[PDB]
Amino acid sequence: DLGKKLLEAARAGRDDEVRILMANGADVNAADVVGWTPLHLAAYWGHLEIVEVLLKNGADVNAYDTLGSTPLHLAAHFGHLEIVEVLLKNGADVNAKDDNGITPLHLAANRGHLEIVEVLLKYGADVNAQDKFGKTAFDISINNGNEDLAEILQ
Amino acid sequence: EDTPQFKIDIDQEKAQALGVSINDINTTLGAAWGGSYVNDFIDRGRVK
Amino acid sequence: LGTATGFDFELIDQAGLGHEKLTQARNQLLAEAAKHPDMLTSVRPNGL
Amino acid sequence: STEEFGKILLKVNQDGSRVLLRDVAKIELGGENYDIIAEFNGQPASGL
Numbered sequence: 373d374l375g376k377k378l379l380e381a382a383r384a385g386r387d388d389e390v391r392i393l394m395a396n397g398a399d400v401n402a403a404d405v406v407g408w409t410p411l412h413l414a415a416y417w418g419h420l421e422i423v424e425v426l427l428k429n430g431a432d433v434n435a436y437d438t439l440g441s442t443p444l445h446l447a448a449h450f451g452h453l454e455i456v457e458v459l460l461k462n463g464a465d466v467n468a469k470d471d472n473g474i475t476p477l478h479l480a481a482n483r484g485h486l487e488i489v490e491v492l493l494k495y496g497a498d499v500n501a502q503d504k505f506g507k508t509a510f511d512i513s514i515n516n517g518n519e520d521l522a523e524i525l526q
Numbered sequence: 527e528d529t530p531q532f533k534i535d536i537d538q539e540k541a542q543a544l545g546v547s548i549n550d551i552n553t554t555l556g557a558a559w560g561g562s563y564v565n566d567f568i569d570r571g572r573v574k
Numbered sequence: 575l576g577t578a579t580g581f582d583f584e585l586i587d588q589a590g591l592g593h594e595k596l597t598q599a600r601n602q603l604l605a606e607a608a609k610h611p612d613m614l615t616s617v618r619p620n621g622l
Numbered sequence: 623s624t625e626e627f628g629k630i631l632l633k634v635n636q637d638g639s640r641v642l643l644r645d646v647a648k649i650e651l652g653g654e655n656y657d658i659i660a661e662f663n664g665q666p667a668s669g670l
Contacts, residue, residue: 505540
């Protein structure tokens with residue numbers, strides 16, 4: 373019930389009410405139907421201040437949905453540089469693989485988020501990492517046809 | 527309001543590699559999970 | 575305009591009996607009509 | 623977008639080489655037809 377209000381508050385971008393639920397001790401790793409935590413929703417809808425509050429109150433940063441995707445996966449896909457940096461500060465698995473073998477770098481490379489791609493590499497991303505199809509972030513940049521990204525991945 | 531939706535991505539190369547048609551993939555996924563109106567039949571003298 | 579003293583009757587299958595059961599019903603109605611030559615004359619089906 | 627059309631995989635060679643659509647064609651946003659060209663006092667223009 374209280375963990376449910378936290379999921380709706382973390383998504384609806386309400387900073388004030390997300391903190392009120394902590395005073396009342398709301399389950400910070402309260403997972404919905406698809407297995408998304410409040411951290412998942414804040415990383416998705418681009419709520420930076422909610423991400424910081426959550427991790428402060430002991431949010432599991434390496435929490436994964438029913439398909440193996442982490443909050444870092446969502447931040448790096450929707451191009452949330454700041455949110456990506458916060459999660460990596462708080463100890464997000466940079467080489468986190470989902471069910472399909474897709475990493476947070478794979479998703480940054482696909483949507484062509486050059487600044488985030490650089491943050492992930494900085495923090496210890498594996499460029500030679502492969503998905504279930506054997507395609508790397510370099511393989512992506514060539515098919516997608518990104519020059520600025522391909523030279524960064526070399 | 528927006529709701530979670532299951533985004534599946536068909537890999538074209540992998541399918542072309544295994545020799546599986548995309549038409550068969552889409553018909554299989556669509557017919558199975560969505561339903562497919564094939565043709566009419568006669569139920570007690572009425573077209574259904 | 576047809577003719578005067580002429581009528582146009584429609585026997586209807588209202589419960590998915592079928593063509594054969596409706597034929598039997600028509601044949602049954604026609605046979606009864608033929609036993610009233612004093613009221614009805616030339617009671618026949620229009621169809622084949 | 624034109625980038626997504628560009629990376630349409632047509633075929634895969636025996637040496638593992640991807641023949642994309644941009645490798646055999648130029649991709650760009652262009653008119654359905656190029657028949658009608660309008661000018662307002664000489665400069666480029668359109669209208670209804």
